[PDB]
Each structure stands twice: as structure tokens, then as C-alpha cells.
């Protein structure tokens, strides 16, 4: 029976310069997949036999900065599980 890490702000350690950390939203979010219902099939040009419902650990807010010379990284500042195919 296994656990999954909360979706939170971790620290990216390749871009983090001391006293200038870059935060990344890493973590786990709830998802599920069951077989596509009949209703839905009668909606598809190409029948999909399985339906996946999913949320994903993403940035609620962030600021695009630049670091270590010329990397143009986006530094997150709040996470949450959201639409996965954005």
C-alpha cells in the first residue's frame, strides 16, 4: 500500500544559487482511469475504450526570471493540482 508526495514547492538544485533559490512544483495529484462509458462512445469518431480523468501538480503562480548567466527559468511560488493537458 503506497504513499505519494504532496504536491508542493521543492527546491530545484541545478538553478538554485545560494540566496537565490529557484522553486519547482513537484508532487503527486489524484487521477483515475476506468473504461469509457457507452454514452461517451456514441460521441467518438474514433472510439476510445478507456477514459482517463486527471489533475496534475502545476504552478498556481510564478515569475520568469533569469539566472546563472542566461538561463531564463520560471520560478514558481505556489502549487496546486490542475488541468493536466494545458
Amino acid at each position: 500500500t503506497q504513499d505519494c508526495p504532496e504536491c508542493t514547492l521543492q527546491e530545484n538544485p541545478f538553478f538554485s544559487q545560494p540566496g537565490a533559490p529557484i522553486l519547482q512544483c513537484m508532487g503527486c495529484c489524484f487521477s483515475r482511469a476506468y473504461p469509457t462509458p457507452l454514452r461517451s462512445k456514441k460521441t467518438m469518431l474514433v472510439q476510445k475504450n478507456v477514459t482517463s480523468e486527471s489533475t496534475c501538480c502545476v504552478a498556481k503562480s510564478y515569475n520568469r526570471v533569469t539566472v546563472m548567466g542566461g538561463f531564463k527559468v520560471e520560478n514558481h511560488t505556489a502549487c496546486h493540482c490542475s488541468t493536466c493537458y494545458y
Binding site: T1, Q2, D3, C4, P5, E6, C7, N12, F15, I22, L23, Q24, C25, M26, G27, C28, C29, F30, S31, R32, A33, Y34, P35, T36, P37, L38, S40, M44, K48, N49, V50, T51, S52, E53, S54, T55, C56, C57, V58, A59, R64, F71, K72, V73, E74, N75, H76, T83, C84, Y85
Partner: protein, 110 residues
């Protein structure tokens, strides 16, 4: 149980089974895949081939049939359903799977 955010594993639930043509719609006990899965987005821009994310998904499947009651003479009433043996955390391949978001509890007759 002990996990707060359970990793992807089959969990049994009841799903609505019906065939276009028989009076009733029934429900059968099966196992689907539901759980948590680790995702993350890149911080570095210059977005090199954007990192595709994973969904909790079927691994090993089994099928079980059932004879639908009420079906008139002629119509075939045996309907097979998928049952999750193994669940795994992998990407949603858009060829076979309908990769979408949360519809609130679609597993239901009527």
C-alpha cells in the same frame, strides 16, 4: 489506511453496464485504477519538447462477461467488461485513451 495520498493501484468500484437494446442497465463489481501519481513541470524555458505528464493507468487487464436481463430474442446480451489486475503510472497515450480531466462520477446507469 495509512497512506494520505495513495499511489496508483486498482480499487474496486461498480460500473454501469448496458447494451443499446435491452430494457435494463445493470452494475458490476470490478476494479478500476485510481490513485496518486508523481508529476512536475520544467522550470527552464526555451521549452525543449515539453515534458508530457503521467496519469494513473491500467497495466494488466482481464475481461469478464455478463448476460444482460430483459434483452429481447435476437439481440446478444452477453457484455464483457474490463477488470484491472495491475495498475501503473504512465502517460496517457491519446490513440487508445481519452485523455481528459475530472468528470464527477460518470460510473453510473441512467
Amino acid at each position: 489506511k495509512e497512506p494520505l495520498r495513495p499511489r496508483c493501484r486498482p480499487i474496486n468500484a461498480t460500473l454501469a453496464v448496458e447494451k443499446e437494446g435491452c430494457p435494463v442497465c445493470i452494475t458490476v463489481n470490478t476494479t478500476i485504477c485510481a490513485g496518486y501519481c508523481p508529476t512536475m513541470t520544467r522550470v527552464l524555458q526555451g521549452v525543449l519538447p515539453a515534458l508530457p505528464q503521467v496519469v494513473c493507468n491500467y497495466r494488466d487487464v482481464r475481461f469478464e462477461s455478463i448476460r444482460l436481463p430483459g434483452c429481447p430474442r435476437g439481440v446478444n446480451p452477453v457484455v464483457s467488461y474490463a477488470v484491472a489486475l495491475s495498475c501503473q503510472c504512465a502517460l496517457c497515450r491519446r490513440s487508445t485513451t481519452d485523455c481528459g480531466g475530472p468528470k464527477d462520477h460518470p460510473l453510473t446507469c441512467d
